[PDB]
Structures are given as structure tokens and as C-alpha cells.
Structure 1
Amino acid sequence: PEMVRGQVFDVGPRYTNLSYIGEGAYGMVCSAYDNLNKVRVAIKKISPFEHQTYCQRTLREIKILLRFRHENIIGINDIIRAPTIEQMKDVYIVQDLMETDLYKLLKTQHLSNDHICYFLYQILRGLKYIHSANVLHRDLKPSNLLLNTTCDLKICDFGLARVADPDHDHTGFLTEYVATRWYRAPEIMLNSKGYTKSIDIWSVGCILAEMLSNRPIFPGKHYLDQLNHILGILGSPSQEDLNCIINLKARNYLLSLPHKNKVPWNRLFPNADSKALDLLDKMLTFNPHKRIEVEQALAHPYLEQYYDPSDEPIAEAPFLPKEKLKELIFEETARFQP
């Protein structure tokens, strides 16, 4: 078997000429030559079977991506694993080879307003499909957005995704949460489990702000610090918005803070398109009930050059210990045998 960086990466004989790309949430990622389709591909090696939560994320990623079919969501082209459960220790997911991700791109490249507009259009177009399937991505951030050489954008990594459940979204103040801190909506720290679609719109708002300046807008250093970054820009929530927070611990925390004025978007982003900042304001709305939804965002004037609801498709239908989960992962990957 071909090896890379001292560890096994046996994808052959179909995939050859391996090249290491990097280390991701699951393990090692390489590019390789697909001898059948005569193209290079990306392959990620996943080794989850020791742990409930690892097997959880792997099953979510595989199940969702195999059911979704959308130009702005990465597909699964192939899955490589041993022929038997007994012999299966690793799973390799084969996907289209992209040129970069938005995290790497924003480290070194200034985006033109035309690129910002096109990227945001594609994020929202993909998210319209995700949300139409009743699925929440719950971890949108630049490193989960891949781009090819012609700047086609694909949403990746559904390992933290969930089916939306707005009737069970309420929780207490400072409830623990898993998704990435800088892209977390304020209500996560206050009273929300992140089971409603507005959680994803907040993340997209954060991504838009980061495309405008090449810096995260809310770079909190720890859990409650994240909220104090958000409030330092949005300012103090209104009485109406506080009245929507019935939980006393969360409400009284906000009431305990000195008054903070809103920082105007055009002061933070003096080079930005004014229509972009209008949409940014609507995505980064404190009250999740007032926050713009994905289909309204697509119809915003900023996106007028691209908006076409007939070309923004929706999903055909809405969407346990490790031993049962290994069995599920084995079952979910059977179609690629062999």
C-alpha cells in the first residue's frame, strides 16, 4: 500500500500518485490520481471507530452528503473501506479536488467586491438547499467552504449538522456548545441550543464580514468573551429584544452591562458596498426571530446580479453505541463496493 507521512493511506489501485494536502478534523487529506476518471481528486482518511462521537460525526457527514445533490455542496464521489466490518478500521472519502478553502484564501488574498458578492451568493444558494431539507449545518466558517480554480464554491463538513427542531431550542444561560466560537450566534450563549435555521444565517453574516476585511469580526478568546465581542459592535440589545429572552439568568446578565452604542457598519468597513452592509446588518441581527432568512437574503438587492429563484433548487424531501454506528457506517458505504 502507498504510505504518506509515515502512515497507511491505501486507496489503490484506483487512486495513485498521492500528495499530502493537510491535516483536518478527521485525519489526513491527500490528493491522488483517479485512474478511472482520469482526474486528480481529494481523499480524506477517517478513523473513527473507537469513539461514539467520532462515529457520530462520520455517519452524519456520510449520510447527509450522499443524500444531497447540489452544485454548492461538496459531493461524495467514492468511499473506500475494507470488504468486511471486522477488517474495516479506516474509511476514505473521495471528493472533487478543489484549489483552496476560504480560510486559506482570506489569509493572503484581498477579495474584490465582485468576488465577495459571488461567494456570498453561492453560500446562500447552497444553504437554501440545506435548509429546505430541514437540516442545519451548524458549523459554517471559512475553512468549511471550498473553492476551485474558477471560484466555484462548495459547502463541506456536515459532521455537526442536525435536523432543525425549533420547538426544543430553548435552554439556560451559558449552556455548553460545540460549534466554532467565532461564528456562534449570540443566543447560543444566552438561551439557544442551536436547533433553528437562524443559527446558520448568523455564521454566514460573520463570513461576509470576514470577506470584507480579511479579519474575523468577532474573534472571542473564550466562551463568554464571544458575546462581549458581539455586543461591542451591535451595542446593547433593545428592550423589545431583551423581552424576547424569558430566561432570567440570561436577561439579567445583559441588563447588568453598561450601555454600549452600535458601531456603524460603514465605519468598520469603509470600503464596502453599501448594499453588502445592508445585508450584513440583517444577517447579524441580535434577535434570531428578526434575523433575515436564507430565501430573503438571496432576494436582497446586493445579490441582484445573481438572484434567480428558479435556479436556486431545493431538496426533493426533508431529511446508540459505536458498535451499531460502525455497522451503520459500513451499511451507508456499501454502495461503493466493490
Structure 2
Amino acid sequence: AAAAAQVFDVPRYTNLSYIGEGMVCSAYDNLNKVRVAIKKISPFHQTYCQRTLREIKILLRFRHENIIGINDIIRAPTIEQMKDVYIVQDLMETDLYKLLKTQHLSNDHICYFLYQILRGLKYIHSANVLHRDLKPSNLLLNTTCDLKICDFGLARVADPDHDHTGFLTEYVATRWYRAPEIMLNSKGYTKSIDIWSVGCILAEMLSNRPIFPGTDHLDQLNHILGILGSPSQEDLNCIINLKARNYLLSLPHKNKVPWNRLFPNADSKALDLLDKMLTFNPHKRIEVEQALAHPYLEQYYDPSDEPIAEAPFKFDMELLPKEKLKELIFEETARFQ
């Protein structure tokens, strides 16, 4: 086996450079005569197996310019010999997290990046899937500013009928990008959770800093309400959950901070769209198609060039012992043999 730095056993993928977290390496593709990214996955806890299968099932079903594809999957010919799985993807120079650490974005780059995020999200949502962890780290970029959404480990089939839960239920997705209803009464099974996260990304593109950098579960909601202000009577009436409603009523009144005061340089159309993505009430929050159609994106908007999914996930993929998930992972990866 080739050792990277330990076993990283991948025929047609010759040259090799390490790059972060199993482990990830750049390599050269001898069929396609391009460098590629290869993720070594060794998942066979139950947690890692459910995540792995879900991500493979989703990525293999999706085909879209603004969603990372799976080029290849390397594994053993038998379940017995299958210990690791290698996932081959397009090599992308950077991500939006790394870009925003060092580079101011022009309004034209902001607009183009936001257009590609929403065009990929339109496809995702059309497949009845929620990403549930959209953040700068999960938006890959190449040297010509093509953007691809990655990391479907926390994705779920949408289920708005079963989205209700108790106050401060545990949640896994990244704190700073979590919609306020996650902290109040939501399992994150509605499409409006992804639109909130895109709004947070747009704000981050405008200022090179997270707009809601909460230190904890409730601090995150306080950061949100410090900008949005206290929710209206009507938005609180939508919260039936008593502990969540009473929590909101316990908070000091806060006035809205206008977007143009936070972002005095920003295009006013960008701020009008930001406002509509970062709406407290998920029912009033803009839908992905409405965001695409917003005036800020008018230079790009083309519904005939914004495809929807051929094969949406009609039903939940249910939780299964490891042995079954390993077997599922084996079957799902069979086409690359």
C-alpha cells in the first residue's frame, strides 16, 4: 500500500499530497489527467456509518454544477476485506471560509457566489433534501470562482410535518449558522433552516466576519435578537411551545438594528435580500426560488438554467445495526467496481 504520512491505498491515482481531516489527500488522476481530492473514510461507530451512507446516497443521486460530485469510490471487492472507503472528488483550490479570512470580496463576487449557492440549494430542496450545515467551510471554490456545496453528513429528507420539538433540544449543526427556531421549537426538518444559513453566509461575505458568533446555545439566539430585535406579537403567537414562548417574553426589549448601519458599504439590493433571508418567522422567510428571482441576482437569474432534481427522495431513509449499514455502504458503492 502507498503510505501518505498512514495507509492511503488509491491504482489510477499516482502522485500524492496530504491535506487535513479519516484523512484527505490531493492526488493525480491518470484517466482524466487532472489532480483530484481523495477522502479516506474508515467509519465501520454506527454514527459514522449512518452519516457516510446518507452522504454517499445523496451525492450519487445528485448531478449539479454547484454540488460536489463523487467521481470515483475505491473499496475492497468484498465486505470482509472492506475496512476503508476512498471518495474521489474534483480538486477545489479553496473554500469560502479560507477566502474570507484574507480577501475582501467585490459586490460582483458576492452576487456571483450567492447566485451559485442558491442555484445549488434550489436543486437540493427540489430533491426534498435539506443540507442542514451550510457555512463558508462547506462552499468549495476553484481559481475561476466556480462554487460547489459539499458536506452532506448532516443532510436529511425534509419532514416539516414532524419538525416540532421542545425548547433547547440538542442540535449538531454549526452554532453560528443555526436558525432561531432550532433553539426554540424546531428539529431542523424544514427548508427554511437552509435559507437562514445562506443569509448568515451573505452577511459574512459583506463584512468578512460571522454576523451571529454566539458562544453557546442561548447566546446564539441573543446575538440574533440583538440585530433583528424582539420578535413581534404575531411571530410569538406562532410559538405554541410554552417554555420557548416564556423564554422570549423573559428577555429585555431590543430594537432592530438596520442592515445599512451594519453594512454601510453594501448594495441596497443585497441588504433587501439579506433582510428576507434573515427573517425570524420561518413561514415568512424567503424561499430559495424567490431569492433567485430577487433583484440583487437579476444579472444571473435564468430558471431554464437552474435545474431541479430528476429523482427526489420521497421518504425518510430510516436509522439499523452497523453490519446492515456496512452492507448498505457496500451495495451503494458497487457501481465504481
Please indicate, yes or no, whether the TM-score normalized by the shorter chain is above 0.5: yes
1:168 to partner: Cα distance? 0.6
CA distance in 2, matches of 1:31, 1:61: 20
TM-superposed CA distance for 1:225, in Å, is: 1.1
SS at 2:89 equivalent: strand
The CA deviation string for residues 110-145 of structure 1, in whole angstroms up to 9 with x for no partner, is: 101000000000000000000000000001010011
Q: Which whole-Å deviations, capped at 9, do the CAs of 1:20-40 have from their partners, x for residues lacking one?
A: 1222xxx21111000111111
CA distance in 2, matches of 1:285, 1:250: 18
CA distance in 2, matches of 1:143, 1:231: 25
Aligned equivalents of 1:87, 1:79: Cα separation in 2: 15
1:82 Cα deviation from its structure 2 partner:
1.1
Q: Aligned equivalents of 1:229 and 1:189: distance in 2?
A: 12
Deviation readout 1:138-179 (Å, 9 max, x if unpaired): 010100110011000000111110110000111110111111
What CA deviation, in whole Å up to 9, does each residue of 1:43-102 have, x standing for no partner? 0111100x1110011001111000000010010000011111111111110000111011
Counterpart of 1:8? 7
For 1:322 and 1:179, locate their aligned partners in 2 and report how far apart those are by CA, in whole Å: 23
| 1:247-278 C-alpha deviation (Å, 9 max, x unpaired) | 11000000011100111101111111100000
Counterpart for residue 100 of structure 2: 106
2:33 is matched with which residue: 28, 38, 41? Answer: 38
- What's the secondary structure of 2:20's corresponding residue? strand
Helix, strand or coil for the counterpart of 1:22? coil
Taking the aligned partners of 2:140 and 2:19, their CA distance within structure 1 comes to 13
Q: Percent identity?
A: 98
Give the superposition deviation at 1:104: 0.7
By how many angstroms is 1:222 displaced?
A: 1.0
What is the 5 A alignment of 1:79-228? 79-228=73-222
Q: Judge conservation of contact 2:39–2:88 (CA < 8 Å) in 1.
A: yes
Moved over 6 A (4+): none
Q: Secondary structure at the match of 1:43?
A: strand
Secondary structure in 2 aligned to 1:8? Answer: coil
- Structure 1 residue 9, shift from structure 2 partner: 0.7
Query: C-alpha separation between the residues in 1 aligned to 2:270 and 2:336?
Result: 43
Return the offset for 1:16.
Answer: 1.0
| 2:40 match: secondary structure | strand
CA distance in 1, matches of 2:98, 2:207: 14
Tell me if structure 1 keeps the 8 A contact 2:61–2:311: no
Whole-angstrom distance in 2 between the partners of 1:64 and 1:252: 39
Unaligned runs of 5+ in 1: 1-5
Mean Cα deviation higher: 313-322 or 71-80? 313-322
TM-score normalized with structure 2 length:
0.96
Aligned pairs, number? 327
Q: Determine the C-alpha separation between the residues in 1 that align with 2:107 and 2:18.
A: 33
SS at structure 2 position matched to 1:33 = strand
Taking the aligned partners of 1:145 and 1:166, their CA distance within structure 2 comes to 26
Residue 225 of structure 1 aligns to a residue whose secondary structure is: helix
Structure 2 SS opposite 1:95: strand
Cα distance between partner residues in 2 of 1:206 and 1:165: 23
Alignment match, 2:16 = 18
Q: Deviations over 1:296-328 (max 9, x none)?
A: 000000000000111100001219111100000
Equivalent in 246, 252, 258 of residue 258 of structure 1: 252
Determine helix, strand or coil for the equivalent of 2:181: helix
Query: Per-residue deviation at 1:224?
Result: 1.2
Tell me how far apart the structure 1 counterparts of residues 185 and 193 of structure 2 sit (CA, whole Å).
12
Q: d(CA) in 2 for partners of 1:98 and 1:317? A: 27
Contact residue 37 and residue 91 of structure 2 kept, 8 A: yes
Contact preservation (8 Å) 2:37, 2:88: yes
Write out per-residue CA displacement over residues 195-249 of structure 1, whole angstroms, 9 at most, x where no aligned residue: 0000000000000000001100000111111111111111100000000001110
5+ residue gaps, structure 2, are 313-318
Per the alignment, residue 3 of structure 1 pairs with: none
8 A contact 2:15–2:27 mirrored in 1 = yes
Q: Distance in 2 between matches of 1:326 and 1:279?
A: 44
Q: Distance in 1 between matches of 2:254 and 2:95?
A: 35
Distance 1:73 1:156 in 2: 6
How many Å separate the matches in 1 of 2:106 and 2:20? 27
